[PDB]
Amino acid sequence: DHEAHIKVLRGEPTPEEMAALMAVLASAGGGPAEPVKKERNMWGHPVDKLRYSVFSWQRVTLLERTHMRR
Amino acid sequence: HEAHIKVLRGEPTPEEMAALMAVLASAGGGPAEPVKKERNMWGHPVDKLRYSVFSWQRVTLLERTHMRR
Numbered sequence: 001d002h003e004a005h006i007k008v009l010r011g012e013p014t015p016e017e018m019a020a021l022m023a024v025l026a027s028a029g030g031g032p033a034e035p036v037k038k039e040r041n042m043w044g045h046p047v048d049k050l051r052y053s054v055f056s057w058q059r060v061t062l063l064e065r066t067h068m069r070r
Numbered sequence: 071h072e073a074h075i076k077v078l079r080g081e082p083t084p085e086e087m088a089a090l091m092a093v094l095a096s097a098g099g100g101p102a103e104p105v106k107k108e109r110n111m112w113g114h115p116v117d118k119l120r121y122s123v124f125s126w127q128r129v130t131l132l133e134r135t136h137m138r139r
């Protein structure tokens with residue numbers, strides 16, 4: 001077992017007070033942060049708006065990098 | 071060190087020499103002012119092509135075509 005658990009570092013609550021603590025913390029706990037269906041959509045990405053000199057190395061290290069990074 | 075016209079057989083008289091050269095000089099048609107023409111890259115074909123975002127032709131065709139002078 002290698003999960004990181006909640007620790008009551010001080011105090012010794014009764015099982016009712018444990019239940020109250022858990023129901024509060026569990027309903028306070030954040031919802032679906034970092035959502036599972038964050039689609040990719042590169043339409044109009046800011047890197048395509050920039051002017052690049054025809055020989056600008058940022059055409060490799062910014063533009064192509066940004067399109068191809070997955 | 072210039073390359074001169076040569077006549078290889080027979081000798082024309084000065085009159086025939088003048089007529090020969092005069093007609094050849096008349097045949098020297100052309101622009102009357104041969105010099106390096108004005109550069110205008112507007113709408114050059116290489117800008118019209120689709121290049122993959124990682125296509126090496128973005129270096130060896132598109133960029134070299136724009137930058138070459």
